[PDB]
Amino acid sequence: ATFEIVNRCSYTVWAAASKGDAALDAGGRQLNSGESWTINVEPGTNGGKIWARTDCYFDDSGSGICKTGDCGGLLRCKRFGRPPTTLAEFSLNQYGKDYIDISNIKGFNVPMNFSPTTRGCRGVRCAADIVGQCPAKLKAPGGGCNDACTVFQTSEYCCTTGKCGPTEYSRFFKRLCPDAFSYVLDKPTTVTCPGSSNYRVTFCPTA
């Protein structure tokens, strides 16, 4: 499957793509404002994610740091990124269909749209100013708006036992972005797409 990753933000981002235990395609790349990077994701990829990283430095070897979304200091991510990270999430070719969503469960750094480029389903978007409106206790000094699990490490926020409810913090994310997951047991906003669809992830879609 092809994923065209487009940075419409006025600032550079370092896109990242991983299924947690491996890179997808090269795993990461710099995207200056307006640039597009198209990756190939293997059919059947389960639990894949794409995100943006901000304020990165990388040496000639591809090693460094980012203020949001850092994946073990690598340009080419093999693992998931450090919160806060708005997440485009997908599982492909699962019994004939693809499944996509956006999630704020690991916080929010950059607004995004995640849409099919082929027929048969809708896209999803979280493009409100979550960083500007972020509750004071969730603001990440390094940049972004943390989720409450990251900040407070409680079973209620982290849904550790599989039982949890919505919270004042989850409701903030849900108010700003109704079409993204705000906590682990949120009413799902996952979209079913035809199997083997192709996609576009756009950072800062309203910019």
Swiss-Prot record:
List the coiled-coil residues: none
Sorted alphabetically, the keyword list is: Cytoplasmic vesicle, Disulfide bond, Signal, Taste-modifying protein
Q: Where in the cell is it found?
A: Cytoplasmic vesicle
Q: List the disulfide bonds.
A: 9-204, 56-66, 71-77, 121-193, 126-177, 134-145, 149-158, 159-164
SMART domains named among the record's database cross-references: THN
Does Repeat count among this protein's keywords? no
Q: Which GO terms describe its cellular component?
A: cytoplasmic vesicle
Superkingdom of the source?
Eukaryota
- What InterPro entries has UniProt attached to this entry? Osmotin/thaumatin-like_sf, Thaumatin, Thaumatin_CS
Q: Which family does it belong to?
A: Belongs to the thaumatin family.
Q: What job does this protein perform?
A: Taste-modifying protein; intensely sweet-tasting. It is 100000 times sweeter than sucrose on a molar basis.
Q: What name has this protein been given in UniProt?
A: Thaumatin I
